[PDB]
């Protein structure tokens, strides 16, 4: 990526091909000659490059035209169409930029956005850029939502997400150029420590890490190549497949042991036959030797029959003697073969208890990344979005991720402490009923042309409903809400006054005693340039530890830390925080996951807007009224901050197309 091809890569667009969206908006071009397609693609990539080179200020149409080169600037209406397309779909002039053309005071259309999360904030900024009247309703006393930064003094720690998963093709790169974000790289070097406190030998860490990656590849093979995706009419989870693969490895170990000891019994019974023949031969030789001596002691002179008897017994004995010699040779061969076999037994077990514990730690890191137990992830679809990972190393915000939503909230009409209770959508418009969270007797009515729903998947899953839709959401939406998974993971912020750990290490692990507790405080983060450690809770432990007080949780943390760094090097923390995201009623979990029985098509279903029925019977109903954005609505980038950003940009573009008209398609 460099030049205009790099601008296309950074915008998640193929540089040499028109996309489905571009085909929808430019059908005259994609159906026509290839030359015009290349002209279109160059204008698109060049406008993207101009925007990405300086995303601090607005990129107007005149600026795009005069920074272009002939022959490309000769067709001004195509350049204008491309610019308005990129502007409308949020590929240029998104985020926080110095406006050149100031907003029109004459506004058009009313949109009510439920929630001031990153998706809601981005969509609000875009719809405000398009000249619409936008008002946000957020239940919390703060913006950001699942971007939540604890601050006390100069101590700072994210209880939301804190990691930017690469800048290659990430809109958060543009955002970070627009905001005062201190980004810091993450040294993925991570030493482990068993429950006792002994560090894991490096060799063994690598053994089990390789075996874990191989087990994951084995589950992938089990899914794709053998169609092991349904069992007794139920979908197979990644945990089921991992159990099956591990059981088959142990089975193979036992099969190899059986094969080895069976070669041993075969060789030993060969030896038994040989020794029996040797015993019978030694007996015949003893008797032949006595016969020989008796015949040979007939003192000469002898008649020729006795002479023949002597000579005959002699060579008969010689023949049997070299028979015995060859059999003893074979005995030696078989005995050394048996010594070799008994010296080379195959593998003893598949995994030791210690092996299994460290493998459980790797499984806990996986459960942490996915924010759910592996028994819930869909075997077939849990890794669908891996294709769209960004390039570059994963970073973090050292001054707190909250600076991004805060900065996005500037200039927007946000109603904090405003809990939406009911969304009414009709043919002629919508009304949203809300309450003041501080005193819920007080009630608000907001009337609007469109409602943009940013409610987390956990809130939409809530039964009984926290938010009621009138009329009810259609079954194809509620079933998608059911099928999708909403996971959970928690963090423990431990603020000390002295650094007692390895400063060069960004993060280190703790191996659990049991498979059940493998997620219980399994990982520690040393990112912030301050005496702050971040313990992580994942898996079933994430859910179970929420019913346990901060005292007990910090006590278990300090127990592990004493066992690792010495019982005296660990002072009592000055300040502590424990997140409980599943209990938080404005979230009811961490982020979505591809549950077994679900797919990415459910992520697409979540984004489909709702068109209410007609008020007057027999009247036409064109307009849709209820729109959905957020972490759980974007198929290719779920469970991320940039995914929410992109979903917000998408829904803002769609609402603007619906209510302001798409000028760029003619």
């Amino acid at each position: 990526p460099s030049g205009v091809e790099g601008a296309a890569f950074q915008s998640r667009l193929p540089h040499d091909r028109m996309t489905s969206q571009e085909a929808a908006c430019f059908p005259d071009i994609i159906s026509g000659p290839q030359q015009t397609q290349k002209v279109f693609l160059f204008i698109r990539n060049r406008t993207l490059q101009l925007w990405l080179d300086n995303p601090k200020i607005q990129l107007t149409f005149e600026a795009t035209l005069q920074q272009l080169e002939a022959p490309y600037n000769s067709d001004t209406v195509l350049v204008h169409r491309v610019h308005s397309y990129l502007e409308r779909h949020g590929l240029i002039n998104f985020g926080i930029y110095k406006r050149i053309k100031p907003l029109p005071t004459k506004k058009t259309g009313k949109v009510i956005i439920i929630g001031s999360g990153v998706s809601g904030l981005a969509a609000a900024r875009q719809l405000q850029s398009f000249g619409m009247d936008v008002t946000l309703l957020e239940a919390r006393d703060r913006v950001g939502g699942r971007v939540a930064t604890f601050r006390k003094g100069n101590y700072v720690a994210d209880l939301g997400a804190m990691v930017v998963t690469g800048l290659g093709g990430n809109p958060m790169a543009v955002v970070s150029k627009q905001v005062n974000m201190e980004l810091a790289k993450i040294k993925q070097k991570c030493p482990l420590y068993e429950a006792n406190g002994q560090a894991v030998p490096k060799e063994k860490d690598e053994m089990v890490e390789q075996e874990f990656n191989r087990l994951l590849e084995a589950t992938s093979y089990l899914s794709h190549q053998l169609d092991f995706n349904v069992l007794n009419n139920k979908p197979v989870s990644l945990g089921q497949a991992l159990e099956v693969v591990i059981q088959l490895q142990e089975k193979h170990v036992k099969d190899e042991q059986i094969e080895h000891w069976k070669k041993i019994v075969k060789t030993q019974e060969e030896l038994k036959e040989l020794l029996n023949k040797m015993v019978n031969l030694k007996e015949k030789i003893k008797e032949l030797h006595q016969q020989y001596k008796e015949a040979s002691e007939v003192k000469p002179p002898r008649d020729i029959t006795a002479e023949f008897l002597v000579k005959s017994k002699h060579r008969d004995l010689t023949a049997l003697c070299k028979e015995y010699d060859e059999l003893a040779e074979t005995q030696g061969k078989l005995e050394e073969k048996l010594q070799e076999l008994e010296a080379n037994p195959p593998s003893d077990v598949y995994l030791s208890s210690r092996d299994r514990q460290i493998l459980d730690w790797h499984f806990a890191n996986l459960e942490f990344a996915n924010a759910t137990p592996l028994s819930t992830l869909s075997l077939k679809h849990w890794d669908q979005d891996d294709d769209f990972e960004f390039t570059g190393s994963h970073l973090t915000v050292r001054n707190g991720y909250s600076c991004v939503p805060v900065a996005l909230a500037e200039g927007l009409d946000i109603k904090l402490n405003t809990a939406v209770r009911q969304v009414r959508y009709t043919a002629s418009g919508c009304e949203v009923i809300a309450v003041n969270t501080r005193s819920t007797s007080q009630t608000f009515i907001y009337k609007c042309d469109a409602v943009l729903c940013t409610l987390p998947l956990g809130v939409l899953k809530q039964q009984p409903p926290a938010v009621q839709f009138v009329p009810p959401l259609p079954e194809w939406k509620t079933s998608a809400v059911q099928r999708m998974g909403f996971g959970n993971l928690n963090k423990v912020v431990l603020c000390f006054d002295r650094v007692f750990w390895d400063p060069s290490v960004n993060l280190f692990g703790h191996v659990g005693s049991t498979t059940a507790s493998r997620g219980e405080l399994f990982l520690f983060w040393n990112l912030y340039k301050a005496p702050i450690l971040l313990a992580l809770v994942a898996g079933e432990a994430a859910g179970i530890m929420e019913n346990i007080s901060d005292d007990v949780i910090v006590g278990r943390c300090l127990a592990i830390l004493k066992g690792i760094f010495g019982s005296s090097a660990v002072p009592q923390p000055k300040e502590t925080v424990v997140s409980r995201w599943r209990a938080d009623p404005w979230a009811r979990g961490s982020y979505s996951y591809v549950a077994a029985g679900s797919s990415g098509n459910d992520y697409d279903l979540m984004a489909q807007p709702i068109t209410p029925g007609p008020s007057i019977p027999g009247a036409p109903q064109p307009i849709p009224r209820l729109f959905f954005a957020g972490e759980h609505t974007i198929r290719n980038y779920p469970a991320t901050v940039h995914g929410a950003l992109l979903s917000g940009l998408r829904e803002a573009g769609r609402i603007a197309d619906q209510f302001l008209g798409a000028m760029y398609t003619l």
Binding site: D141, N417, T437, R438, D550, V578, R580, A583
Partner: peptide, 15 residues
């Protein structure tokens, strides 16, 4: 009351 209602349950789980 809902802010005051969530705060009390969060402190409940907090102890």
């Amino acid at each position: 009351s809902e802010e005051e209602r969530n705060a009390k349950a969060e402190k409940e789980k907090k102890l």
